Amino acid sequence: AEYQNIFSQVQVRGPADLGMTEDVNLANRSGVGPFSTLLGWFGNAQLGPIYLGSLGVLSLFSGLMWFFTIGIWFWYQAGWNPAVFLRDLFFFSLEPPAPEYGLSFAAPLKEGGLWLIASFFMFVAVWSWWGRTYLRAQALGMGKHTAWAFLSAIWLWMVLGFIRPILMGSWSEAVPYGIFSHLDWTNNFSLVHGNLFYNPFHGLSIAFLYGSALLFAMHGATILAVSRFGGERELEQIADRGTAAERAALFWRWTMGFNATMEGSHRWAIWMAVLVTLTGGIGILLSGTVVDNWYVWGQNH
């Protein structure tokens, strides 16, 4: 049993870490939460503190206002009966306004207005959280990478729920809120546009999605394999290359004939993942607005 660094053999605990103070307004950080020994076998045992400024409460609130909206509707659809609710949970669905109403905010509450309300709550939840992304990084003097990458996820989501429905002239074109129904939505979207397999942006997007699993498997495994020379201390291995970063480059270079740097590998990483939603959103955005049929479009590129 040669050991693998997948689970910790011994946990070690010290005084709670209240973290770095940079330009952060400490008035908004809570106090430390508890310490999970369970979590601790795999990563850090410490919960919190969390920073909750004004934008944080906004996000957390409208967010919470996005999830009760769908939930009263789901509860209605159950006829207020709790055993039905559980039974039919994946079946309930909050559908958007019918095609007759185009982009109007007119549609009755019980037949599309609730959709828009929840959507509204979601819109301000996601963008305010995006702000939070940038601002926590500013206060720490860090680069803006997290926010840029998160923007790429926002792009797909924006395009499905908001931009594409607008460009197509109606909210009926947007995605319902339900577990099964959003899946149906997806299958049907493909059927109606001549099969997304013919959409070259769909293919790219798969390429990066699979690519992400490939890269993160590679990366994670590589770092764990050189964790016997401190390889996970990636920032210092950036500033002063050790044997960990050398032995890792060189496994790849002996394997496939080229390699990364400790820093470089993270660039491959951010881009591999980000391109999933970058290409994905373009592909959706062009569907029905410019290409009614990917098969057909494909026959002429």
Binding site: Q9, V10, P15, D17, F35, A45, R228, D240, N259, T261
Partner: protein, 238 residues
């Protein structure tokens, strides 16, 4: 047609991206060299990027890459063949000499610092409030190498203060001196700590540290280097 405009632009943007990425990944180890240290002829189709400079945080300096490259250390190996592409035989004891899978780099001879400028790693005994919170506490266990001989006893754990994690066991020898073993190379069991990499007689050979309450990056390399090397080089005695 707009969608074939989009896909064509994208392939172009993607070629530029691979270019950026691949050159970004040349800020170390390049230029390529012949087995004897001189610049190789075929450097590949990618040019080196324009230098960048990281500012280090604790009065600790700059790093600028690409930059002049050198091992800053003797490499006890010699060629075993008359042309490019073969193994280089250890000219001495490879464990002692720091070659092969016993290699270390000439990293800085100072310790890694936390965000507050303190030593990142301390022995637990000098780490205020720090204690084992779960799993078998190794302290006091005998340490056994791959010959199934006892090589000493655990006398503390060195802990990463900011990440609250075990990084080394400090082990005492018949001698009364101690060595660090990397936490990742030991198996803690209920009646012992087992070390498959090293045989009892190779413990004394583990590179030692100059101060008993801190380790420099240079020292960590030599130690980690040395114990990983034993998986190949202690294999006779295993």
């Amino acid at each position: 047609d707009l969608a074939s405009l989009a896909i064509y632009s994208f392939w172009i943007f993607l070629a530029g991206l691979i270019y950026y990425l691949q050159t970004e990944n040349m800020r170390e180890g390049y230029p390529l060299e012949n087995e004897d240290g001189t610049p190789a002829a075929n450097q590949g189709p990618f040019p080196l990027p324009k230098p960048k400079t990281f500012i280090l945080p604790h009065g600790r300096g700059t790093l600028t890459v690409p930059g002049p490259e050198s091992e800053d250390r003797p490499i006890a190996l010699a060629r075993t063949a008359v042309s490019e592409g073969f193994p280089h035989a250890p000219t001495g004891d490879p464990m002692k000499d720091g070659v092969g899978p016993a290699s270390w780099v000439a990293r800085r001879d100072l310790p890694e610092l936390d965000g507050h400028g303190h030593n990142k790693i301390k022995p637990m005994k000098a780490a205020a409030g720090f204690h084992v919170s779960a799993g078998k506490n190794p302290i006091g266990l005998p340490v056994r190498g791959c010959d199934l001989e006892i090589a000493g006893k655990v006398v503390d754990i060195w802990v990463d203060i900011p990440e609250q994690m075990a990084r080394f066991l400090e082990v005492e020898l018949k001698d009364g001196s101690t060595r660090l073993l990397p936490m990742q190379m030991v198996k803690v069991q209920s009646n012992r700590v087992h070390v498959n990499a090293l045989s009892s007689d190779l413990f004394a050979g583990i590179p030692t540290i100059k101060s008993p309450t801190e380790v420099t990056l240079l020292e960590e390399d030599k130690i980690c280097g040395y114990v990983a090397g034993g998986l190949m080089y202690a294999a006779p005695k295993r």
